[PDB]
Design a protein around this ligand. Structure first.
Ligand SMILES: C[n+]1c2c(c(N)c3ccc(Cl)cc31)CCCC2
Ligand SMILES: C[n+]1c2c(c(N)c3ccc(Cl)cc31)CCCC2
Ligand SMILES: C[n+]1c2c(c(N)c3ccc(Cl)cc31)CCCC2
Ligand SMILES: C[n+]1c2c(c(N)c3ccc(Cl)cc31)CCCC2
Ligand SMILES: C[n+]1c2c(c(N)c3ccc(Cl)cc31)CCCC2
Ligand SMILES: C[n+]1c2c(c(N)c3ccc(Cl)cc31)CCCC2
Ligand SMILES: CC(=O)N[C@@H]1[C@@H](O)[C@H](O)[C@@H](CO)O[C@H]1O
Ligand SMILES: *[C@@H]1O[C@H](CO)[C@@H](O)[C@H](O)[C@H]1NC(C)=O
Ligand SMILES: *[C@@H]1O[C@H](CO)[C@@H](O)[C@H](O)[C@H]1NC(C)=O
Ligand SMILES: *[C@@H]1O[C@H](CO)[C@@H](O)[C@H](O)[C@H]1NC(C)=O
Ligand SMILES: *[C@@H]1O[C@H](CO)[C@@H](O)[C@H](O)[C@H]1NC(C)=O
Ligand SMILES: *[C@@H]1O[C@H](CO)[C@@H](O)[C@H](O)[C@H]1NC(C)=O
Ligand SMILES: *[C@@H]1O[C@H](CO)[C@@H](O)[C@H](O)[C@H]1NC(C)=O
Ligand SMILES: [Cl-]
Ligand SMILES: [Cl-]
Ligand SMILES: [Cl-]
Lengths: 531, 532
């Protein structure tokens, strides 16, 4: 009854799950797409054909085919992001958590996972939607989408591998929510899409894309924005990487049809094993198969759309973490280690700069170095380490997001900006990594409310505060409850540019988030590189 | 007898002058070259022909012909730099202060005035050598040299106006000191040349020039160095400016001989009246007629000479002041005023940046702006004013000097670096201008020892400290006295790069003077401009 829901494509049977001292309904693994397998690899998604009988939605679905991180075998800090279910190309499913008893027509939040567009799963423990749905009385959906070559191989002009199909997977899931969430007690007119990293870039890409705009009400972007340097490629570069993928597999490269035909005959792991080989440069924070600026999903360049106001005008809430870059340095840059303080020599700093800004000429590398080097103390290994951490985070996350924030706010209907800088008491990563990319997610999803995870009481309060900001924003377009006597999170405005710190201390309001470095990344360095 | 000295070109009679309750000998206005007048305008100097009888050396000579600053009529802060004697092209003279009684063979210090190579006088009150000569028992010489077009009009390939003749004037006075200072009790083997701004650049240029190197022992450079961006031009640019000077005066421009003949017919003020018109850019801290890189006084580019060690290897003492730029902004940049705090709007900041780095493209100007702008607080008029002050001082004085310091120290025999950051208690310029270009000179010359000038007792002690550093360095190559228990001024070395603050507080040693901004000015911005 409560668990048996008839959708437009057939009946589904959810499950009653415990949450804290109560219970909630979960509908796990609902298909929203035809399985993109066989001759439909690389193709746009097709709607899921109606089924007879009752879909058993009591268990999580398969995860999409992806690179699996084996750098630290058995280590929870890295394993927590790996697929926890079987990988399969048959992976286009979504999950729903519904308060019990079922609400009449409540706010909906739709989670879009990140993972550099090459990885990610809806089923991670850290994305368990039951705490947020229960605590804030929202209907919480997590979608899935094809990643890597399966989702973003781009041979522009081909209709068999057009590019951006992972973004179309997300859109088809949003269309499914639009058409079906009313049957689960959700209001399809009050859908907030939120996501982190590539998920936050994705959220911003749906804000830009005309074909997505009417499928949600407002948006939350965590540590990602659509203009991030890693988040898209040109049609020429997407084609070059697709052709190089075929070259790495001894494919016929004479035509798109023959290349695509060759690639469709490979096992999924064969593509994944050579995926990283197509990158143009040795780099960190760069990924092989990402959205393409195609003239269709994106009618024109992202910058021209931002400048002209060609995007959905609504409310957004968005922000960044203090140390976005540290995870990427640990994995890709010389001198960094999980098991040491990672003091960086001058020589390893220069190597990291080159890896961090791979597209830059020597003049640009000199500019980055001068901007982030204390020449009174240039052999200070801690300063070199933290400077490289800042370079990676500023270039790849913070300054792109600040560019987006400032462009969006000129036309939008309300911007709320945060700076998350709380290091969790129970972090398994070393202290030098600081406030890591993605480590606000466990607060957004309410993991500190679980006693067994051993967060502090102040971290539980911070989680409840963040969940309530997010859900109140989703419900109203404003994270603040007016008439309350809590500290108010102010609107980000073009003039005053206010943001808040998110941490366990009383709220602080600041202005012009990392303005000095972002003038460098957003105005001066592009001019230098263009010259 | 003590005042009656026979030199190689004739007898000179000095005068006994009072100094701080005592007396000293002064020989004022001794000629060291033939008057460079008439057909000798623009020509290399010629040695003074011997004279019969006794040259009256009791009064200061004429000053060389120059632009006179009338921005603030009657204001001592500007008038103290203007000529205080009649101007004449007949101006190649030197002055000598000799301790009394005359020493046997003591250290010589030869002052070379600054003034952007367009102005300056040996006779200014602030260059009065009697306090330094008396207090430190040195023979103090101040030379003179042609400035402006008269000293630096350059038509390379012409022997009638070859360029650099003002530098050759300085060299001829150094040659005169070499040949004659022994008759005044000075040791020609222990001559220190020192100078400020263009004078400091000049000192550095004699360090570089093979034809000057044997005419002095060691060198002091104050707020100037030979590689300063204002201190030299190429032969093509010198020729362009000389032709444009002729154009401004309706001269025949068909040949060097015709142009030079035209320019020699003009009265001196006619040249001066159009001198500034030949500059290629609206700018501050740029001067029309300056040394030329000619292949003769300078055998190759300054940078190649510095890189190869093709220069005099000796000891140097040098440094800069905290606020080198402020004087030049007051005179040339929008928003600045002697009578206000000169808070600078963002618009006037951007105008000032353009004036301060005239050779920069738009990307270069963006780079400078970004380096000196606090984008958390970009409408702060004090920060904008102080940022422009730093830009002008860093680009034109501090960072060129640090480039020289580092290149010289690789091959030299001892470097001592200072940072003068004391603002005089009786300064007549407003507070925003800070520790102004040239305002260490009064301490070097011992003016705080004169009670009527109303320096504090701490400033008198600072002046005595500085004079003793300067003269002890001149005597020994080391500003520190041996066996003394005062704090030691360390050698500047390539690795440690130590310098001292010069002020009324106990000496503090620091490292890497202005290192962050000078990486920008000395490495990044030149690379950017070269690449774009
Ligand atoms: C794969 N991964 C890792 C770390 C993260 N913080 C992540 C944050 C967001 C996302 Cl989407 C993926 C993340 C830490 C290091 C282990 C790998
Ligand atoms: C396996 N791999 C990875 C990353 C890379 N940048 C790579 C570049 C070249 C090659 Cl061959 C393999 C690469 C980023 C971190 C994820 C793994
Ligand atoms: C081959 N490789 C590379 C990079 C990585 N981060 C990698 C991470 C994991 C693994 Cl398994 C392989 C990796 C950085 C770019 C250089 C190659
Ligand atoms: C002409 N002049 C002036 C000021 C200075 N500090 C100077 C320092 C050195 C030299 Cl050479 C010339 C100087 C202050 C402003 C008045 C003009
Ligand atoms: C009198 N004058 C002029 C110009 C200048 N750049 C000057 C720079 C500094 C000083 Cl002190 C005086 C200057 C150009 C235009 C002609 C007049
Ligand atoms: C920079 N500047 C100055 C003075 C002038 N008379 C000028 C006349 C024209 C032009 Cl373009 C620039 C000028 C007087 C001395 C202060 C600087
Ligand atoms: C294993 C597999 O899927 N093979 C098919 C192949 O039979 C077909 O001819 C080709 C056309 O695109 O598409 C491939 O996907
Ligand atoms: C649905 O799947 C769950 C998990 O395996 C199982 O417990 C339940 O009995 C299934 N429902 C059916 C078969 O009707
Ligand atoms: C949002 O739009 C409404 C309706 O036009 C307007 O009244 C309101 O001022 C806007 N708010 C912001 C923050 O732009
Ligand atoms: C949480 O802390 C308690 C003691 O404070 C400890 O016994 C327990 O093992 C911790 N939990 C985990 C998962 O380690
Ligand atoms: C030298 O000149 C001064 C003033 O010009 C004069 O008083 C003095 O008598 C002169 N000496 C002579 C003429 O021997
Ligand atoms: C100066 O030269 C002497 C003699 O060659 C040498 O012994 C001494 O080390 C040098 N001093 C410096 C500071 O270079
Ligand atoms: C110096 O101080 C004395 C004593 O007060 C005063 O008479 C004199 O006018 C001052 N000098 C100047 C130039 O102000
Ligand atoms: Cl709080
Ligand atoms: Cl004449
Ligand atoms: Cl050394």
């Amino acid at each position: 009854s409560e668990l048996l829901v008839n959708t437009k494509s057939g009946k589904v049977m959810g499950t009653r799950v415990p949450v804290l001292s109560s219970h909630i309904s979960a509908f796990l693994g609902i298909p929203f797409a035809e399985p993109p397998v066989g001759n439909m690899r690389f193709r746009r998604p097709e709607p899921k054909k109606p089924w007879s009988g009752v879909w058993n939605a009591s268990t999580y679905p398969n995860n999409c085919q992806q690179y699996v991180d084996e750098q630290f075998p058995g280590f929870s800090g890295s394993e927590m992001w790996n697929p926890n279910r079987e990988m399969s190309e048959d992976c286009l499913y979504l999950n729903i958590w519904v308060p019990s008893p079922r609400p009449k027509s409540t706010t909906v939040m739709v989670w879009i996972y990140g993972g550099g567009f090459y990885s990610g799963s809806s089923t991670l423990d850290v994305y368990n939607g039951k705490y947020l749905a229960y605590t804030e009385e929202v209907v919480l959906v997590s979608l899935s989408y094809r990643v890597g070559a399966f989702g973003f191989l781009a041979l522009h002009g081909s209709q068999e591998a057009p590019g951006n199909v992972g973004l179309l997977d997300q859109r088809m899931a949003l269309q499914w929510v639009h058409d079906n969430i009313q049957f689960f007690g959700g209001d399809p007119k009050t859908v907030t899409i939120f996501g982190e990293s590539a998920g936050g870039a994705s959220v911003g890409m749906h804000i830009l894309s005309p074909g997505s705009r009417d499928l949600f009400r407002r948006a939350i972007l965590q540590s990602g924005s659509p203009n991030c340097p890693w988040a898209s490629v040109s049609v020429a570069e997407g084609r070059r990487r697709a052709v190089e993928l075929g070259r790495n597999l001894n494919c016929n490269l004479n035509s798109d049809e023959e290349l695509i035909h060759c690639l469709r005959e490979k096992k999924p792991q064969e593509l994944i094993d050579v995926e990283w080989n197509v990158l143009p440069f040795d780099s960190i924070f760069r990924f092989s198969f990402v959205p393409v600026i195609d003239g269709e999903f994106f009618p024109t360049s992202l910058e021209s759309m931002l400048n002209s106001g060609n995007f959905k005008k609504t409310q957004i809430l968005l922000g960044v973490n203090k140390d976005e870059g540290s995870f990427f340095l640990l994995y890709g840059a010389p001198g960094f280690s999980k098991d040491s303080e990672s003091k960086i020599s001058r020589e390893d700093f220069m190597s990291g700069v080159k890896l961090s800004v791979p597209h830059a000429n020597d003049l640009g590398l000199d500019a980055v170095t001068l901007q982030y080097t204390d020449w009174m103390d240039d052999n200070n290994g801690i300063k070199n380490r933290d400077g490289l951490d800042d370079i990676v985070g500023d270039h790849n996350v913070i300054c792109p997001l600040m560019h987006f924030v400032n462009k969006y706010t000129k036309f939008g209907n309300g911007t709320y900006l945060y700076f998350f800088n709380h290091r969790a008491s129970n972090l398994v990563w070393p202290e030098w990594m600081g406030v890591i990319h993605g480590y606000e997610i466990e607060f957004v999803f309410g993991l500190p409310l679980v006693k067994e995870l051993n967060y502090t009481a102040e971290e539980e309060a911070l989680s409840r505060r963040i969940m309530h900001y997010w859900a109140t924003f989703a419900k109203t377009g404003n994270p603040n409850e007016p008439h309350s006597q809590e500290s108010k999170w102010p609107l980000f405005t073009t003039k005053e540019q206010k943001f808040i710190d998110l941490n366990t201390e009383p709220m602080k309001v600041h202005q012009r988030l990392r303005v000095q470095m972002c003038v460098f990344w957003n105005q001066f360095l592009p001019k230098l590189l263009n010259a």
